């Protein structure tokens, strides 16, 4: 992640890697919203314009994930999908709207100190927080600058005034997409970059001091420019579909 710091053992038992078999590689990131379910970015799985499309077959998934390279032996978990679920009003054509998808693990993952779920909002929770200025941590082993960490990368970002988020871009945004990251003036940087994608936007609830997945890494044209913020997915509006 642009302008970030290295993660800690246990600090996000909810992160999984989107690692195809061959070119045996890492394509994205995901979250454990179950004992046997996983959700993530949409494009991250079906992007025509840059010919892509996968299947359970294609890829295999991985958990317990501190090191980005290694073989997390007896602390790392892994299984391959049993079926992918894209979301029917997806706009890879338009702006990468309802950038979401879920993957029913062919097999169930039993938890531990490294693999532990996340919960999803309620208009309530999704209301206290989802507010200008209130920050969120976004993780992943993406692109250190606009080369790749050896370990996990954690940033913190404040929401942004819905308007200001509009004239950051030039792409037409929907009440479904939410934009994070500090300002030009603010004097401080951060951003989740290449491969940060499909990553969680976990926010902490002061009420029940629970960890609440507020978003999903969708886009941004860049990697920490004095003038734009990244854009993520409303884990919520879409809380219906999920």
């Amino acid at each position: 992640i642009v302008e970030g710091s290295d993660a800690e053992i246990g600090m996000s038992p909810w992160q999984v890697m989107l690692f195809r078999k061959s070119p045996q590689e890492l394509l994205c990131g995901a979250s454990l919203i179950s004992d046997r379910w996983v959700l993530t970015a949409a494009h991250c799985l079906l992007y025509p314009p840059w010919d892509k499309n996968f299947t359970e077959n294609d890829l295999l998934v991985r958990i317990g994930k501190h090191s980005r390279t290694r073989y997390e032996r007896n602390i790392e978990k892994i299984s391959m999908l049993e079926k992918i679920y894209i979301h029917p009003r997806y706009n890879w054509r338009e702006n990468l709207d309802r950038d979401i998808a879920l993957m029913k693990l062919k097999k169930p993952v039993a938890f531990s100190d490294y693999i532990h779920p996340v919960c999803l909002p309620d208009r309530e929770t999704a209301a206290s927080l989802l507010q200008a200025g209130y920050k969120g941590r976004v993780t992943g082993w993406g692109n250190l600058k606009e080369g790749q960490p050896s370990v996990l990368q954690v940033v913190n970002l404040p929401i942004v005034e819905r308007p200001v988020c509009k004239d950051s871009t030039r792409i037409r945004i929907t009440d479904n997409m939410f934009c994070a990251g500090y300002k030009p003036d603010e004097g401080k940087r951060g951003d989740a970059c290449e491969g940060d994608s499909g990553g969680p936007f976990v926010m902490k609830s002061p009420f029940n001091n629970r960890w609440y997945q507020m978003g999903i890494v969708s886009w941004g044209e860049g990697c920490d420019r004095d003038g734009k913020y990244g854009f993520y997915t409303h884990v919520f509006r879409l809380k219906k579909w999920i």
Binding site: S5, M11, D113
Partner: peptide
């Protein structure tokens, strides 16, 4: 049990940056 980090919350740790989250 979800949202409950077994190496922090689950038994009182608070990660180096969480508290920056808090304000």
């Amino acid at each position: 049990d979800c949202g409950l980090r077994p190496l922090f919350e689950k038994k009182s740790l608070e990660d180096k940056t969480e508290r920056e989250l808090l304000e």
